[PDB]
Every structure is written in structure tokens, then in C-alpha cells.
Enzyme design. Structure first.
Site, PDB file in Angstrom:
ATOM      1  N   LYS A   1      -7.715   3.316   3.281  1.00 34.93           N
ATOM      2  CA  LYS A   1      -6.613   3.005   4.049  1.00 34.93           C
ATOM      3  C   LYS A   1      -6.838   4.703   5.394  1.00 34.93           C
ATOM      4  CE  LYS A   1      -4.757   0.391   1.685  1.00 34.93           C
ATOM      5  NZ  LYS A   1      -3.454   0.097   0.124  1.00 34.93           N
TER       6      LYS A   1
ATOM      7  N   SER B   1       4.323   0.192   1.012  1.00 39.50           N
ATOM      8  CA  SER B   1       5.866  -0.317   0.625  1.00 39.50           C
ATOM      9  C   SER B   1       6.294   0.335  -1.045  1.00 39.50           C
ATOM     10  CB  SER B   1       5.112  -1.339  -0.793  1.00 39.50           C
ATOM     11  OG  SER B   1       4.109  -1.038  -1.184  1.00 39.50           O
TER      12      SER B   1
ATOM     13  N   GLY C   1      -4.347   7.765   9.004  1.00 41.59           N
ATOM     14  CA  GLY C   1      -3.646   6.684   7.712  1.00 41.59           C
ATOM     15  C   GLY C   1      -3.594   5.002   8.266  1.00 41.59           C
TER      16      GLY C   1
ATOM     17  N   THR D   1       0.622  -1.491   0.082  1.00 38.87           N
ATOM     18  CA  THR D   1       0.136  -0.245  -0.506  1.00 38.87           C
ATOM     19  C   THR D   1       0.680   1.069  -0.474  1.00 38.87           C
ATOM     20  OG1 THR D   1      -0.044   0.195   2.205  1.00 38.87           O
ATOM     21  CG2 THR D   1      -1.351  -1.812   1.710  1.00 38.87           C
TER      22      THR D   1
END
Lengths: 173, 393
Positions: free
Chosen positions: A33, A124, A45, A1
Site C-alpha cells: 500500500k 479503517s 500510500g 486497511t
């Protein structure tokens, strides 16, 4: 994500994508998210468990409760019980919460960190978001939302683990 | 000459909304006690209380029913939490305390019940002790046998002059707490209570389900089921050592209550299942249910609030839309946060009335009207902010 927090002038945002992966296939594509907390006075988040976040965000919102609302302290206390209790110690996730005052990052390691220019880019895709985010913030007058968004998109095209489904939250002051 | 079930249900209807089955249930229990007294010595021993197990969610009527039932039967009543005893695996306490605690309350009753049924006579004789230290024409005779006989004359106008008018009053109360005592018989009074406990005792055991199994673990199930085992004699028929005597649990009525969300009545220990012959379910309350609770019960919370405020010379009025609005709130909070049943009403009604309750004495003589406007202004925000809800409502 990929979660991307930015703060320009009187606003600060937290944007993220909605890709959920497993192995090499997309589990879900519209995972939310980013959310609002503490009477929508706080935006946050999460990178990780769609439920671990649930448990964490709450306890966090429990710190802002009887701690006036000092974002920083609340975060310090949160990560403290996170790094302790087996319950909490179990769950893994990257926490990014902002507010009128300042934005910061919380981790399972009981780490409360705040990036240089209140610029957050976890997940990521964090690095890609950051590189694009800084390029803009650096050479542009674009708004706190326009950058976090354009930054998130750019990440979305480079990162195989993040998509272009956005969920943005903002704070004006 | 007791009431019939329908009669009992009716009376219960005066305090509890809905939950008809539970009423008929707890009602058959009572009627049967009458039914039993109406039999031959042989059968009177064989026929035991038809103990009941109420199955249902929090604050939806269970306890109130048991409480009102006992009240209606003028029976000594006692509530008890089952899990209290699982603690005995550390120190906890023993089940016999239930009958003991029951008897103590059964005494506090017979007492206050008898002392009150006396505070009037003692006050009248009291003045006959004061109206004796103001005109003492005692002994036999004194003047005439007819006309002059009656010594009341001056005495009459003397006592009246005092009633409406050391220190007489200061003296009487002292005489009150001297004549009343000098009239109570603490012997039969001690046995009076025991008979009660033995023939009308009503024991309420909450959290019965929390005392059940679950593939949980050896240790815990052993502690739980033990409380069940320890309960058997009470419910099967035994004798308990009372600080005031010896009691036979033989005819005490037991009303157990459980959610059974996690555990089923069939998980209960076999011996117990046998002694809980009656099963009954209670439903969750509806917003409509709420609205009725707020007003219908004859001593409803709303009525209490109105009364309390009157005390302060303030006239309160609840609009229908106001009530509806109050009810929805409670429901909304219970669904958005945690459902605690009708209890939610009290919290909501109480937060809603704060400002007035405080200013009350100052609005002396006014006509306040709690309508849907007011309600919304005062509760909508809170109801909405969930986190604020878990603190304030």
C-alpha cells in the site's frame, strides 16, 4: 486497511499494512500500500483499489512533472481532475502523500487536507494508528519510523481489517 | 528487363534489417508487374496487382519496406492513414484524394526527375549564350572553310577563362532558368505522370485494422466500414478525376498494413479481403535486431551521424560495445514505457549525441570515440528514471 504517516526531525514516513479483505475473509495478505514516486523524491500510500492507486499515483506524478515539484499545488491540481473527469471520478481511494516539505491527504471529494502535525492515519485503522501515534509522539523521542511502525502494529491488533504486514517508505533531509 | 525477386530482396536488404518474408512478399508484387507486361493483350487486362496486407507491430519495418520498394522501382509512392476518412462522418475527406494526392506527387517527380535530367545541358548551352556575347562570329562562314573555319580559338580560351574565373555567373543562372524552361514539354509531362501512376503506382494504407468492426457500436462501425466501402473501387478498379487528368486505379499496387491486435483480417469487409490476396507477418525487433539497424543499413543512422559530424571536421567512432549499449537502452525504454520499435533508436541516439553535436565545431580536428563508457554516462540515468523517460526518450 491502515496507513500511517509521521514526520519527526529530518525524516517523514508512510507505513501501511497489507491486508486486503472481501466480505469476512482475507483476499490477500501482502498488498503493498505504500510506494515511492517522482524519482523517489515523493513517498505515498493508498487505501483502496490496488489499481485505482496505480492510475492516481501516476497522474499525481504527472502534476509534480510540470509544476516544478510543489507537492501542495500538484496535489491541488490532482484532486481537481479527480473530482472532475468521469474516468477519475469513478475510482475511490484515500491518498496520503508526503515529501521533504510537508505531507498531506487527497480524497475523491477533491479534498486536499493536511493533519495538524503532518500526522496521517487513513483507512479503517486510521483512528487507532493516530491514538497510538500521538501517545508516542507526545511522550517519546522515538523516530519518525519507530512511531509510524509501532502505531501501525497497534492498529493491526485492534483492527479486524488490518494486519501486521508492513510496507514502509522514508524520506531524509 | 527488371530484377528478379532475389535481386529485389537483396537491394531491400541494403536498407532493412530482417523481415525477410515481407521482403519476398513485396518482391513478388514487383516482379509480377514485369511478368504481366510480358503477356498477350487479353491476359494483360485480366491479371491485376496482387495486393499485400502487412501484419505486425509499430516501427518494425512495414513502411520502410514499401518505401524502399517504390524507390527501387522508381515508382511513384504515397502513404495514407486509413482512419483519416472515418472523419468524413463530420467533414473528413474522400478516398479519391488518395489517387489524386498520389498523382500530384507522381507529377512533382516526373518534373524534378526531368528538370534535373536537364540542368546540365542548359548550363552548357547557357555558356554558349554567354560565349556568344563575348565573341559573336555567328552566321555561316566568316573566314576559311577548314583551318580558319574553327572560330573556337579565342572563344575556347575565352569560355574557360570564364568558367573557372550582368555578371557572367549572375547572367548564366538567369540563362539557366530561361533555357531549361525553353526545353521542357509540359504536355507529355502531364501525361508522363499519369502513365506512372497507372502502371507503377504504389499506395500504402496504414491503420487498415482501425477500419474494422468490433461489437463497439453501430455508429462507429458504420463510419469505419464505410471507409472500407469507399476503398473498394480504388482496389477493384475504377477511374479517378485528377487535377492533371483521368487515372485508372486498375493496376496500382496496394500495400495495406495492420497490427490486428484488437481486430483480425477476417473482420475486414469481404470485398476487401478478396483484394488483399497476400498476407504477411512482420516480427517485433530484438535487441540484436536493433544493434544491426544502428550500423548495417548502408545509410544507417550511425553512418549519417558520423557524416554530419565530419562536416564539422570531427571524427566520430562507434565502439561495438557502444552500439550494443545504445541498442539495449532503446529496448529498455521501450519495455519499461511504451514500445515504439526502431523509432526509439533515433530518440536515444539523438539524446546521446547532444553534447558533442553542439560542441562539434569546436572539437574541429579531434577524434571522438563513443564507446560503452560514454553511452552509459549519457543514457543510463535517463533510461532508469521512467517518468523522465516518457518525456526525454
Amino acid at each position: 486497511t491502515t496507513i500511517v504517516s509521521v514526520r519527526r526531525n529530518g525524516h517523514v514516513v508512510i507505513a501501511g499494512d497489507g491486508q486486503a479483505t472481501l466480505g469476512n475473509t482475507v483476499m490477500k495478505g501482502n498488498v503493498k500500500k505504500v510506494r515511492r514516486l517522482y524519482n523517489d523524491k515523493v513517498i505515498a500510500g493508498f487505501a483502496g483499489g490496488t489499481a485505482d492507486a496505480f492510475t492516481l499515483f501516476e497522474l499525481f506524478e504527472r502534476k509534480l512533472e510540470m509544476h516544478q515539484g510543489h507537492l501542495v499545488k500538484a496535489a491541488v491540481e490532482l484532486a481537481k481532475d479527480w473530482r472532475t473527469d468521469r474516468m477519475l471520478r469513478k475510482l475511490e481511494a484515500l491518498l496520503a502523500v508526503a515529501d521533504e516539505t510537508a505531507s498531506l491527504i487527497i480524497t475523491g471529494n477533491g479534498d486536499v487536507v493536511q493533519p495538524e502535525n503532518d500526522l496521517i492515519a487513513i483507512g479503517s485503522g486510521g483512528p487507532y494508528a493516530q491514538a497510538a501515534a500521538r501517545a508516542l509522539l507526545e511522550n517519546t523521542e522515538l523516530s519518525a519510523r519507530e512511531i509510524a511502525e509501532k502505531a501501525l502494529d497497534i492498529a493491526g491488533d485492534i483492527c479486524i481489517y488490518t494486519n501486521h504486514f508492513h510496507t514502509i517508505e522514508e524520506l531524509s533531509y | 528487363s527488371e530484377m528478379t525477386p532475389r535481386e529485389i530482396v537483396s537491394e531491400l536488404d541494403k536498407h532493412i534489417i530482417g523481415q525477410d518474408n515481407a521482403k519476398r512478399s513485396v518482391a513478388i508484387a514487383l516482379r509480377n508487374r514485369w511478368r504481366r507486361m510480358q503477356l498477350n493483350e487479353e491476359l494483360r487486362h485480366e491479371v491485376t496487382p496482387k495486393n499485400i496486407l502487412m501484419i505486425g507491430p509499430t516501427g518494425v519495418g512495414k513502411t520502410e519496406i514499401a518505401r524502399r520498394l517504390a524507390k527501387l522501382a522508381n515508382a511513384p509512392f504515397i502513404k495514407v492513414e486509413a482512419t483519416k476518412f472515418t472523419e468524413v462522418g463530420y467533414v473528413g475527406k474522400e478516398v479519391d484524394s488518395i489517387i489524386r494526392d498520389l498523382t500530384d506527387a507522381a507529377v512533382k517527380m516526373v518534373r524534378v526527375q526531368a528538370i534535373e535530367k536537364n540542368r546540365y545541358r542548359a548550363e552548357e548551352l547557357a555558356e554558349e549564350r554567354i560565349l556568344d556575347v563575348l565573341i559573336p562570329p555567328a552566321k555561316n562562314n566568316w573566314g576559311q572553310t577548314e583551318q580558319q573555319q574553327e572560330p573556337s580559338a579565342a572563344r575556347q580560351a575565352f569560355r574557360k577563362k570564364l568558367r573557372e574565373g550582368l555578371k557572367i555567373k549572375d547572367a548564366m543562372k538567369l540563362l539557366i532558368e530561361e533555357e531549361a524552361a525553353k526545353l521542357v514539354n509540359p504536355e507529355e509531362l502531364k501525361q508522363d505522370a499519369i502513365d506512372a501512376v497507372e502502371q507503377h503506382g504504389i499506395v500504402f494504407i496504414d491503420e487498415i485494422d482501425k477500419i474494422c468492426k468490433r461489437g463497439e457500436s453501430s455508429g462507429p462501425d458504420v463510419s469505419r466500414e464505410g471507409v472500407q466501402r469507399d476503398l473498394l473501387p480504388l482496389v477493384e478498379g475504377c477511374t479517378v478525376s485528377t487535377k492533371h487528368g483521368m487515372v485508372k486505379t486498375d493496376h496500382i499496387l496496394f500495400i495495406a498494413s495492420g497490427a490486428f491486435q484488437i481486430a483480425k483480417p477476417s473482420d475486414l469487409i469481404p470485398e476487401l479481403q478478396g483484394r488483399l490476396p497476400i498476407r504477411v507477418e512482420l516480427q517485433a525487433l530484438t535487441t540484436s535486431d536493433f544493434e544491426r539497424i544502428l550500423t548495417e543499413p548502408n545509410a544507417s543512422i550511425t553512418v549519417q551521424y558520423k557524416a554530419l559530424m565530419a562536416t564539422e571536421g570531427v571524427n566520430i567512432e562507434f565502439t561495438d560495445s557502444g552500439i550494443k549499449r545504445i541498442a539495449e537502452a532503446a529496448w529498455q525504454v521501450n519495455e519499461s514505457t511504451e514500445n515504439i520499435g526502431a523509432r526509439r533508436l533515433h530518440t536515444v541516439l539523438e539524446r546521446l549525441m547532444e553534447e558533442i553535436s553542439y560542441d562539434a565545431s569546436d572539437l574541429s580536428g579531434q577524434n571522438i570515440t563513443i564507446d560503452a563508457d560514454y553511452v552509459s554516462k549519457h543514457l543510463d540515468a535517463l533510461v532508469a528514471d521512467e517518468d523522465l523517460s516518457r518525456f526525454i526518450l
